[model samples]
Target: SSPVAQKYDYILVGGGTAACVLANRLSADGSKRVLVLEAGPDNTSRDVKIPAAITRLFRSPLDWNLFSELQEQLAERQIYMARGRLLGGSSATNATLYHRGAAGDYDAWGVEGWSSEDVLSWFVQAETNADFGPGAYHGSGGPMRVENPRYTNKQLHTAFFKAAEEVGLTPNSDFNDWSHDHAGYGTFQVMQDKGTRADMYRQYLKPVLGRRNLQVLTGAAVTKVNIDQAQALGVEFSTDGPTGERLSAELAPGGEVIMCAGAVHTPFLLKHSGVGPSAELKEFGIPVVSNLAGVGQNLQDQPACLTAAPVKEKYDGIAISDHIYNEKGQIRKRAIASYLLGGRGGLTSTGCDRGAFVRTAGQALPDLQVRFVPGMALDPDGVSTYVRFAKFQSQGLKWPSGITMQLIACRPQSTGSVGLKSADPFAPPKLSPGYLTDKDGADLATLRKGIHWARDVARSSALSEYLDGELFPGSGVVSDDQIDEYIRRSIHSSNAITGTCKMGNAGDSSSVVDNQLRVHGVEGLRVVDASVVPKIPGGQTGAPVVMIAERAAALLTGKATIG
Candidate 1:
């Protein structure tokens, strides 16, 4: 059925992480009506909830299944990108790791509305932090549950922490407590509750399923926002029509439309809706509603490189995801058994649970995040290529037991772009997150520092009892040029893309939105998602995007709101 005659006060184009929050807040006042259009299904499968089953969500229908254009600088490799397409969005599909950036990182935005102070306020308002309990650094009674793993795979935690300490990195108990400098190794928080993924839909939208004013349409792909004369009135999207034609949903006179379509989809939708550059739109006959040149520029994301080592036969621990290295197949069985009844065991573990936020030796703020994966955390296919690559190792034969140190270059200087390939709404956008293409080479330099420091920690005596030696990107590689070549081949994006539709100072050339998150030259329209971030944060993006939505809701509708 089409919503042809109905009108909503606030129509969100994408039912994603940010949209879920908006749906909960905008509809809190029963007098107002809000509609959410999602392109994916209402997935409640065990694969999505089980912490260890994070691999099952990647590239699946629950995911957008998007891929980047061949990175021009990085061996011309096209990286596989995953975005949550379901009810909860990426929060449900992610590894359940709930991380936040430094207060200074947010304050450095230099935009008026969002700052370190404002970020903390919204986090205090949105977070129901279970790990740190309640206090100045954490929150108690909010929707999203941020809990710590009950079991940290003692073997992995002890070895990694010892390695970090050996390298002189301070140990931090609270990663979110910016009271301490954002430098330290600690057990990171997970966005889970009682061992299940604490998705935004469950925390926010699901509870308000019965709300009279809130309406959600699953399998609704928002092709374009219905715009006219530089104003967004509603949306033209698809439901379940026989020919798969789009449907119309208008808004009230004083109402507006919010684009929560994320970094990739938001810019694409805007361009398709004729709100992007008039020159480009005219080529595709997408009559220009606005001429925003910065709609899809300045795309930034953290690029990660993996370093692995074989774990000695004497040491072993619980493996969350099953693969060749996880020799004991019963580990998964135990996890399933425990979760079906008690919600514990390997199933409760978020892969790469024990990690650290550390500054490069003499740097001021942390530039890299290191995750110690006892097994293959990167491969979603459950296949370990360690043995295949082990043939080139200086001295290697066994790949049964291994660990990977995933190094994420958090503060990257390289920025890429996304733009319309044509005017077709359903066509994929041209996404090119030009990784490692910084003219000054600062991004690569920061990554090089992190890569070497990670090796120091691994080679140090702290992990001697458990770790064998450097396995992949082994000791054979040297020279600054050689390291750059290695990163170009091995680098993969963290799926934390942002800054495409940046919020900036008035008349800022590269900005698409204002401090209030309003579109640069359009009325009754705004963007409220990762795309609005002026600068990408140095930690997982979900927490920050949620904070943005929380603050945006307050500005949109003034009140202490709920689902």
Candidate 2:
């Protein structure tokens, strides 16, 4: 069948955080025609709506479920990787923690006009805090509704803060504030409103979706960017829903094409469109149009793992909704009934209710982060349950109340890449996260410290009264070697992927776009998502993605540069 040629003033390649912001802003003029091509359908599943049900989306239909090749360092296990495949992308399926990372993170960018000070303003401009005191750091009038989780239990919050204080770290009341260096314990800020998951689609896209000039086409997989000479003219895409329906979008005379396809897919799309390294392109028999060697390089991410044990109290993992799945895949009927009766029970709880960001040895910034979840549960690896249960068994306890602590190496020094297995855009891209590549390096050192920290929490006076014994790497395994082995066996990705299409100043060979987010050497082409981050943020990547989208929108619409 002949390809149909559609026209638009702005064509966004992905319907994610960046696409949501760009489409809303560009179409604000009410005259310009804007189109967003998404590879996935609308997220109508209940899993995408409930804030606590977010974890279920992983490895499901709503997730891309990409897996990494076996790593040489660790037993060569193929790690499971997850990315959003629905309308709002990861935001629709992610734990809605609304953290903006440290201000110094942006300052480290050092790119002209893209300094921390410059970007912090945009973060403030994009947020609409539904809770807490609105100040210079937070805006009151914005599309995104930022709220605090309503069901924060006192016991969990107390344990988190007490544990941090016991370990010599001050508690930060507001991690999202502009003053990133401050510390104290506060309620978790969430991208939710009254229990519904409020993603970018709800904040930025839905409000303006009714506009005449804006068009949103779901299930459209962009195969490649259409380039004429050196300039990008449009994109060639296929409709996944319609089955093999190919189409091309022609840009308006002076129009632009922005890619918000995320870290993994953005580079894959660029490479498939012939915009990567010459050698790689030749290997795949793809035409090398730009020879940008860094197109799929410098991938970075944080690692996570859960630690838990069984309890004798007959505590149900599910207390409020039929949504939560227990270890045996049983639904908590009692909890669901309680939740339906009133919004005050187990259904309102998110497993990981509290967290702490701490600096490891010799680090001026926080390198280790932890999230505490109440319940005796095992992750897919069964590390948490095994370790905790072993500890209790050693202590001669049949069963005990258990807490699962997830420790992550936040400031990892390791790097990886994304590459096309073939010239075909339909084929899943090969991903190598390079986890634990920094053996005996800074990141591994940090992980060791984190393991020690977790051990400390297990031994702390605050938790001693209620605890039976140490779990996974029990009290018997006290050496650094044991901890290192535990980390190697249990470490996994936190699903916070970034830095594929990094942004930087001129002469930065690794960067795919400039500080302004415009693609280097290509006019009318820009990147405005997590892919453009020079480094992954300290916390979850969602808030950072939102901030990037807000800043990118201002730059694209001439709003930031105008004033």
Candidate 3:
């Protein structure tokens, strides 16, 4: 007995950040049947619900735990990539911060029907923000909950803001406000409800799980899309087990197949399903349904590095790292009691509640982002000890109490690719982040400047009360050459992967989908995840992903017509 044997009007591959929205909206009407195929299990663990415990899911079964290919520039390191393999996807495993990015980000895409003005309503439609009103750029009755940080470190945040202002960066009341410059320091809003994490599944799909017309199958990994005559008819998948059971599901007449498998896995699925570069598919014995070269190309993500300093003494403000657990690797009883009583406590803190978005000299849009974290950044090696320690035990290594400032080169010019490693769908895809490999060295140069800026902020007089001395790169490592060498050894992924399956005009050779998100040269198929992003936005991508799915749902429901 398999749910695949039932009739489906829409088959969604990957029940991730976008798929949850699609399944909820598409199944609104009882007559239309929708199916969601998720490769991971249900999001049931307590770690997924606690904002401070996000890294706990990093290397656990709940995470995809993917790693990148060795990078030549970053000391030949393979960066660890964690993606949510549960109902809510990365939205469940992320830092829970929310920012819509600069409006210019959308206009820069230059794709028709996707301008800033065109997508603003969708962003407003997705969040019921408590801080912002239901005005031009904010909403109050949407599915996703948005609020200011409840347990954010007020002391450190104030100091960080003053330090940024001292360095000439402006103050911002709201980063989502289009009226103000996106280049400023401010507290970030998060997708949380009363301190608990608010993922897409919790906000969108979970509320509507009782709908009879919608079906969601967890632990079902889709191997390929059953494309016939350049149209997606269905898909072949496998259930979870040592020896999994193979299955196939087909759509009814006039049905559609949508891909929301994300930037990393979506392109590999497209290539495996025979809708990628013709020569590459042929080499793997996969019959090419369409010779589209852009399926696995244009892989884009942000690279980041951090600077930290030891705190002289613990401040009165709350910090998740200080209170999340005891030295014995167990949850604090007081912390648990406070959280259970009213979603209030250190457990509610993401430890990344404040940050800044700023531009370099003469740049129009923000190209650098700095995140302020009231915690330590261990693991001089490639793997993040922050993520590893999420398992409750620190492996007996003594920890230091400090504050970390992370700098991200937001608008990177470099690009990479994701391709099939083998014909086997179970095999991990080959990912080359191509960090700092740009011809003009702009990305690396941006990071170099950012390191100087972050170091200055950490040493500013405003933070002198909390911090004692520079812990990394030291005061002696001055000059561009020394800083560049330090950056190469420390740079890591921000996990903002996008642009592998690009959205563009009809004649563009490097685009996989049209302005309507339908795959070029293929019928009844569309991609609605970060994979279809033509240009990666300047900030965290979770909000943009939700906006894309909201608009796509309207298009499918006929409330919004495709131009």
Candidate 4:
């Protein structure tokens, strides 16, 4: 037997966002033996730490590089989806904006033990807001770092805020402030230290790596849960590399296993473990342990579209391209030197520094999140900014300059599913975003309204000085019909995927895990990740994922209790 075959009290699958928190929390008790298996490499890459270079990691080796199935409603286009293939997971490679979303969102879940009130403390327990320290709505000492942008184009942000105000959007300073409702235009806080990213690995796992009871195995992909007669046994995994070995780890008596492989992979792992819908398992020639119809149902994500306009050239220091690159299509060397010397420079910025949450007419909660990007969202050929940046240096191309408004329909009515594409454990799961597939077309109408409001924001007196005319869906496409068509062609995921393995009440047919995160028909097994989220939050999933892990640790260790 290999070293990894040693028995453990708890085995955590996927050393990702939740697993990072669980590793630090579950192993605190020296009495327990904890093992975390991650399918990716380590999270020490320089590009992952640099705030401005996040887009550079999207299609790199660090990413899973998943693409969604073609959306019939979206002009039959396949959208690019990137998941982190390293420790800290998406937190190590996202926009880094920190948000709690609306309290009512959790309340609307209708599931016991997960109301806004019950989850608020967990959110507070996970944060250490450097900018706004220790308050009723915030935390002072915690593992995660939450702070204001250290690097920013102040002039551009000021104009964007002014334009939002001009359009009658409320001016609110803090979105994470639980004391007030979530509806306003303002700057967003990020998860960063002086300049480097504060992903969960750095925040939680790094500090406690010396613990004897905890062991994290990277490049070890768990292929099966090893369930027997509806009782959890342990896991079987295969290590990466040519000389990699197939390993098996059995649980000590009364031990447990938890799945934290995110929304997409978690269900895939479950179905492979014989714990999904019976019919699907039979199709793959696998035995069924639990005929749970909801293993990969209710997939939810925020749908976003971009609107860009070229700058008029009179406004200086406005476009992000001018700040990050020089006239010769090269990254500003001075910024790099400054960052390398003291972690201070334009490279520290999380490009979209300012954002807003708005509740459209008659909405009970904020349904729109507008992200302000001070650059052309797409190149002249209509390629994504991330794609363009990936090829910038090699292609020797000039950077595009303009202001782009990203409008996200946060509370999307549409839903999709993640399922098995093949019986093989190495194959990727089938991901269908099903964007704008709601029967009433609510998601479509919301984006249409967002486009109109974004146009007005660009035309506002404060922002008009920096822009000329629309670059996307030009002025000719004005009517609702034309706008609808534009939306179908340009819409994309905001990357906040959730709800593939949702939590719900007992006997709930559509729930994969119960309120306590335990798999419904299995013993000594649970799922703790964004996949267990009953619904997608109105904002980013990174912050909420941390909160979920925090609460999960409390529940697992008997430190806290809920319904």
Candidate 5:
């Protein structure tokens, strides 16, 4: 059945981080009618509801499950990339760790209207921190709820804290406080509301869905933005399914169209609408609506390395149910059952319970972000289980277990791009994440420092009681050359991809959008998602993404008043 075409004052394409904020704020005026089109369904599953079980949501229907092309450096292995296909997008499936990258991160944007000072105010406006006090860096009465977990194991907590101190790192109580310099053991803050996942949908869209002027269309895949003589008129989308059951909506009086389709889809949407590189669009038979050369370029993501070793003492005291992944699936099922029934025990775990942001060297900015998991196995997709018997023999210990730590380069210099396989919006775009290309010099230097730091932490007096020995690259692989090769073979993305439709000054040829997030040379069009991040944030991107949405909403609605 072809649905009736509807006109709206503003049509938001993509229901991810940005769309949610825009929908909520724009409707606040109570005069302009706004519509939000989402390709994915609503996430109301137990997997998404529990804060600890959030990682399990990846690769499910809620996940976009996009894969990158085989990288020449990674033995030509095709890597899996997961973006949220549901209302909340990646925030629905991410670790729920709330982190705002360093203040310098936004300062570097330096675009005409997007200075660090301008965006910081917006970041504060969007957050309602439950743990931290009100100040310039954080807010206390906003819709988005950021809270720390109620429980953490003592053994793991002591080890992580003592080890960090033994290695001369300061223990920071709050990373999001007024100062970014402090570091230490503290509960991870997440976007969770009363133990349930509080995604953008919950924080931004749901509250306004009942409004007479706002409309939300789920399961509608936006194919293209309809443009007339370089001015966006509306969008062409498929309703209810992926097939070509198309419909269009003419813009309402004084209407505008915004694309918040995330980093991967936003560029494809623009190009398909004939507003990208002239040569590329011509190749795909897409008429050039605007000749912006930087539509899908400048991709950036962090590279991570996981290292694990067996321990002798059974970590029954430490949380392992969160890390256990049984290929047989029995253990996972039991864990899920326990949580669904009791709301306690294994199901309450958020996988990694402890983390620290530190400079691998004595550098000013943090180059390595470390996450400590008290179990073995690298389950990036969050579904696989680790075999319990995959233990080492002859090492003296109590229980035959181990710890896995992931080291990620916070801000990477390397960049890549996304290009269309065809003009077809249904076809997945070609993703080239040129990792380590620009990092040949700095990345290697940082990784070496990271390796030394990790080894030191493992062998520190505080952690020596639990340690058996180095399991990755083993004990004898000390040469810088060996470490470099190991990093090249083991590095993978943290899935924090950004920079496709980067925001910058008009003269910056590489920038796809202006400081206000308006698409260049195209009137009545804008992009307000991770795609507009001028560069990758220093750490996890979820918090910064919310900030972007807050600022974008204010800009779109002419509400410059941000408390």
Candidate 6:
């Protein structure tokens, strides 16, 4: 609302998803001053709220619109990453699929005070289960409204289920409930508050807007933390800079700093502040603050193989685009009409509705996902439209009434990194995720199996009425050799980046932060985001991170900072 002060009880460096939660909960008692700094503008666009307009939000002004370094595995396809620069981060721009990983996923961390049983408390506290009734895994009390959308294509969802069964997967009603085994197909839960995108900014931050103790400033980018004697004092930042005009701020007494600036920005912040691998910092001439080797290493992401097929049946609505330039204007108008009149149409669906988390051969947990998307079929021209989304963030887009399935390998054995391109904080990090480069060939092997299964589903009797033929690699590319080549060309990044600022015991050289969410050898500094996740979970990274914010709040409130 005004110029940021020199001090506050808690200073969050980014107004992202987790930062919003921390801003809300840390200042909830009306006793402490909390300030949140966001680099992007405050956005509340219709494209952000409507579930169907999700892809349009990508590469928009609200998005950071990052791109991976040309990958060798995918023939130098610079995969576009759509991280939100707005108040809510990707929770605002994403498809809003909400889910929790298997219980064992958390327990496997083996860190004290963060067992599955311990962490589930925070998850339950943060989730406000709206439509589906509560049970052991779900709770009804939080402000974050999560609902299973009623405005969906029941027929399309059912077809996904039937095709999954055709490939020998069982039907499951809810993937969030951990009471059953992880391997099954079902209608996925979404972060929806009555049909709109239920992002953290809407659910957590906006409600606490009038609180005098909390001040949120948008369009302010943090350069680096001001650290002295291994103590994070405060941060120096710029308003409307990328223009070089700047200001400095400090933390008040008993105050600590938290970084909720997602995986890429968090590590970038750390390395820029001189707390990362010593050699890399030396390249940028940044003095070593801690020499933590894992500050921007251990990067991991889910590798996805997208295969599309033409459908015999026409789907309901359109992806947002210019009606005059794009050929799909009629479909777009019909979808908009339905939403304006009844709040139900293609606008209500998030493209990915029905999918399965299935256990593959020799896996202890389900590590593979067979995802479904309806009315998202695209030609090569469509790819150009999407590229414009990355370049200029607008276009005349079109989608065919077809089905696409992305066989995503959730638990990959490969590891990669987020390295510094320069000392400049504004530049995007050098992202080189060596997708499917595991020595044991685990990633490609798993994905190869997934391709076989997916192909079977497309050819199944259950899907015979819907799909006509394969679109991408085609039905003829069946051999292992052909599929392997196809797999390399088709694979994409899920943007579930994690492990750059790893969480582990202090003795563990591969970690940057300890069990308490505190940076090792640093005072009053913590990286409270997905960057600290030691391993990627088997589910979407969104819901797991909200829980992390909840845990951070509990820790700040003196419930359990360290175990």
Alpha-carbon error at 178 in model 2, in Å?
3.6
Residue pairs with backbone atoms closer than 3 Å in model 6 (clashes): none
In model 1, the clashing pairs are none
lDDT of 5 by residue, 1-563 (tens): 33256678899998888788888899997989888888998867777777655455555678777877888876576666778887877777776777777767766777666656677777788888877798888799788888766445566657867888898887777777636573454456767664567788888887778898888878889999999886888998987566556888768766889998988899989999998899999998999998887888988787777666656455433546333334333345665565556544444556564677777657666777777766654442112322122231122333335676777787877888888888778888888877777845776666667777778888888778777776775776789888877777767667788889998875888888887778988888988888989878777788888888888787777876432
lDDT for each residue of candidate 2 in 1-563, tens digit (9 for 90 to 100): 22245568888999987788888988998878898988988767876766656545666778787888787665677777778886788888777887777877777767777666777777777888877666778888778878777665455456656766786777677887755572334456878766667888877888887898888888889999998778888998888543686678889888898899999999999888788888998998887778786788889898875555332234432222213433434445655665556444445555565778877675666787777766554442533333343233234223324666777777788888999877778888989998878656777777777777777776677655445665665656678887777777777877788998898888988888887788888888888888888877788888888887887777777777711
Off by over 4 Å in 1: 241-243, 316-331, 376-399, 560-563
* Strongest candidate by TM-score: 4
TM-score of 3: 0.96
Instruction: Work out how many backbone clashes candidate 2 has.
Output: 13
Q: Against the hidden true structure, what lDDT does model 1 obtain?
A: 0.78
Assess each prediction's global lDDT (C-alpha) against the native: 0.78, 0.73, 0.85, 0.85, 0.74, 0.77
lDDT (Cα, tens digit) per residue for candidate 3, span 211-263: 98998899989998999977889888998632687788999898999999999
- TM-scores for all candidates: the values are 0.93, 0.90, 0.96, 0.97, 0.90, 0.93
Cα shift from native, residue 561, model 6 (Å): 5.4
Instruction: For candidate 2, give the lDDT of residue 557.
Output: 73
Runs in model 3 deviating more than 4 A are: 313-319, 327-330, 380-383, 391-398
Per-residue alpha-carbon lDDT of candidate 6 for residues 343-454, written as tens digits (9 for 90 to 100): 6665677666668887778599887887776644453222333444333322334445566777888888898878788777888889877888889989898888887877
**Between candidates 5 and 6, the TM-score winner:** 6
